[PDB]
Symmetry: C3
Subunit: 154 residues, 3 copies
C-alpha cells in the first residue's frame, strides 16, 4: 500500500533529521562550543573583509562580533591572530554598526583608534574593524586581509 510506504518514509526522514541534528551538536561540542554560549570558529585563512562576509554567509553564520569582554576574549583565542570583527562604519563615517544591524553596544579600541587613516595608500580611509593579539581593536582598510572568524548562535 502506497500510503503505508509513504508513512514509513516520513518516519525514515524524521530519523535522519534527528541524526543530522546530533551530528551538528557533537561537531559544535568538539569545536569548543560552551553550553548556552555563542560558537566561534576559523579555518585560519586571512582575507579581505568582503571575502569573510561572503564566507561566513556561505556557512549560514556571520562575521564574529563580541558583545562584551568575554566574547571578545573567546574570539581572540579562536583566531589566535588578527581577525576582522562584524563591525564597520562604511555607511556613515564615524558611526560604527554591526553587519547584522545596530549601533555599538560595546567596544574596546586602542588608545589612538579609530583614526580612519588615509595614509595606508590602499586608497580611501579605514571603515573596517579588526582585533589585534592583545584584544584591542583598530579600524583598518576593508581591502586588507585578516583572519576569518565566523560566529553561530548559542
Amino acid at each position: 500500500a502506497i500510503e503505508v510506504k509513504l508513512a514509513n518514509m516520513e518516519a525514515e526522514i524524521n530519523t535522519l533529521k534527528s541524526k543530522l541534528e546530533l551530528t551538528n551538536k557533537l561537531h559544535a561540542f568538539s569545536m569548543g562550543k560552551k553550553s548556552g554560549k555563542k560558537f566561534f570558529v576559523t579555518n585560519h585563512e586571512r582575507m579581505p573583509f568582503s571575502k569573510v562576509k561572503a564566507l561566513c554567509s556561505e556557512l549560514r553564520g556571520t562575521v564574529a562580533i563580541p558583545r562584551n569582554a568575554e566574547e571578545n576574549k573567546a574570539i581572540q583565542e579562536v583566531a589566535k591572530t588578527s581577525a576582522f570583527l562584524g563591525i564597520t562604519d562604511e555607511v556613515t563615517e564615524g558611526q560604527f554598526m554591526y553587519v547584522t544591524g545596530g549601533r555599538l553596544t560595546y567596544s574596546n579600541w586602542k588608545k589612538d583608534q579609530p583614526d580612519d587613516w588615509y595614509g595606508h595608500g590602499l586608497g580611501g580611509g579605514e571603515d573596517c574593524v579588526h582585533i589585534v593579539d592583545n584584544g584591542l581593536w583598530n579600524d583598518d582598510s576593508c581591502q586588507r586581509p585578516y583572519t576569518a572568524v565566523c560566529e553561530f548562535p548559542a
Copy 2:
C-alpha cells in the same frame, strides 16, 4: 507517476543515509578516533558532574571511563586539564561503580585517595572521581566543576 516518484525518494533517502554515515565517519576521524577503538571528546568546559552526565547523554555518549592505563592516558591528553570520570560511589559509599553499572576493573588512585572528604565545605563528602596530576585519580564533590569529556564506542 506516483509510484515512480515514491521509488525515487526511497533511493534519495538511502543515498542521504549513506552520506550522513560518511560524514560521521570523517568527523570521528578528525576528532582523533583510532581504528576499532573508543574515542574521547571534550569542549573544554568545566561543569558539575550532573551537567557532564546530562551533556554526554544528549550527545548519545557516556561520561569518559578509563578501562586501562592506555585509555586513562588518552582521556588525559584530550582533557589536558582535570576531568570527571564516569565513576562514582553515590549508590553505596565506599563502593565505586561505573555510571554504566558494575564494579571497577582498573583504577589509578592517588595515594591517600579516595577519602570522602567533608572539609571542602560544599556539603556531603566526595562521591565523584576526576583525574589530577600524573593521571592519578581523586574522589571529589560531584558539585565541583571539572572538564566534561564524553566517550563514544569503538
Copy 3:
C-alpha cells in the same frame, strides 16, 4: 492528499540535502580547509601503507599527495610527525608514481634518498614514501607504520 504528501516529502528531502551540505562545509572549514584549496586531515594514528590507503578510501579521499612546496608544508603541519604520502614505486621499481595515477613530478627527497634499502629486515626493499618532520622525503617499507593523513578535493 497522496500527491500533497509526496510533494512535502520532496521538500523535506531537499532541505535535508541542503543542511547536510552546510554541515560538510562547516566541518571542512573547522578542519582548516582554505578557499579553493584541497585539505588534509589526520586522526594521528600510525599504520602500514595499505591500511592508510583503505582508510582514506573509505572516507572518500586519498592518501595525502604534495604537488608543490606549499602543500608539502600543509601536510607536515597537519601530520606533525612522519606520515605516508600517496606516492610509491610498487608498480615499477625506481619509477615513482601517484597512487591516483601518473609519474612523480614535484619531489622533495632527503639527501641520498630514495635508495630502495633492504637492510631494514622487514623483507623486500622500500617502495613507499613518507614525509619526515622537516618536510623532506624518504622511501621506506610499505610495512612500516606511519601517520595516516588523507586529502580531500579543493
